[PDB]
Amino acid sequence: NVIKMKSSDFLEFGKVSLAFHRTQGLMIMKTVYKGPNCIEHNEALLEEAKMMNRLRHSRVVKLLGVIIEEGKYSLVMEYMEKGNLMHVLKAEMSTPLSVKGRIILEIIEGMAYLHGKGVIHKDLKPENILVDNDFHIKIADLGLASFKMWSKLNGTLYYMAPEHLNDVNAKPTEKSDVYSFAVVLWAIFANKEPYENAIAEQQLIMAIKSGNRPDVDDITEYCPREIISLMKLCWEANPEARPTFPGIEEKFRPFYLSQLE
Numbered sequence: 001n002v003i004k005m006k007s008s009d010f011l012e013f014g015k016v017s018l019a020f021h022r023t024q025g026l027m028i029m030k031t032v033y034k035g036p037n038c039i040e041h042n043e044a045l046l047e048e049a050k051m052m053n054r055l056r057h058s059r060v061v062k063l064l065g066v067i068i069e070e071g072k073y074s075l076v077m078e079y080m081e082k083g084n085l086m087h088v089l090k091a092e093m094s095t096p097l098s099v100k101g102r103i104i105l106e107i108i109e110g111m112a113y114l115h116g117k118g119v120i121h122k123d124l125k126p127e128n129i130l131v132d133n134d135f136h137i138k139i140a141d142l143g144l145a146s147f148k149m150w151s152k153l154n155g156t157l158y159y160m161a162p163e164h165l166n167d168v169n170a171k172p173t174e175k176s177d178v179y180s181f182a183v184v185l186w187a188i189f190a191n192k193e194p195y196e197n198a199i200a201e202q203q204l205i206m207a208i209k210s211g212n213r214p215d216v217d218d219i220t221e222y223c224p225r226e227i228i229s230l231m232k233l234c235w236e237a238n239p240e241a242r243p244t245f246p247g248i249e250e251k252f253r254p255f256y257l258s259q260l261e
């Protein structure tokens, strides 16, 4: 079961607050609701939390607790000191090849874990890749794409597979996440968002659906050839042409090991 937490256990998407738990220290509280009583929801919510709490691995964030109070509902998640991946890439300092390589490996590990549990992320992107004080990463579902009830209770398209652009009814598959990961590889080397010279959303969506992809040229820092190859394979228009995360890991780990570790 999930840990039940109380708002009075604390000191000083949704209302996101760095909160100091009076016993366990710094955590992140995502208060998803404040308003009229709605106890009818409760059961479901609790259940959902438990389900989502079974997803435990070094490379995914932990649900530390839930607050289920009269008209106040909160998810409490571990605190990731360095914030999201894009924030980390965009700070004054910098990162060796080896470290960006490790970040990629840890992303692969996390996604392989989720897929091994039968869980499709659906919204993998740098905002959902959080970084600890030691530059190790954990994948998160901050937009609550998989927490259906908490989402109900309660938006870049740059990393979304083209089969979902202008088709919201198509079901996502593991390959949806593999595409997202390809654009993440790009962003890790460009240190910024793709498509900066797109005309506008409509035309850009149509261009991506017709095969346009992030500009490999706008990567001006060094990116290993096999990571360029990898991102191009993972963003193939045909989802069937994209590899699985196990296939990805079984190529990437020894490359990281033989050239980057």
Ligand SMILES: C[C@H](NC(=O)c1ccc(C#N)n1C)c1c(F)cccc1Cl
Binding pocket: 030, 052, 053, 055, 056, 060, 061, 062, 063, 064, 075, 076, 077, 078, 114, 119, 121, 139, 140, 141, 142, 143, 144, 146, 147
């Ligand atoms: C295991 C991880 N859990 C959280 O992302 C999570 C835990 C606590 C909170 C909050 N708030 N989140 C978003 C998680 C899921 F549960 C479901 C789908 C993807 C991922 Cl990465």
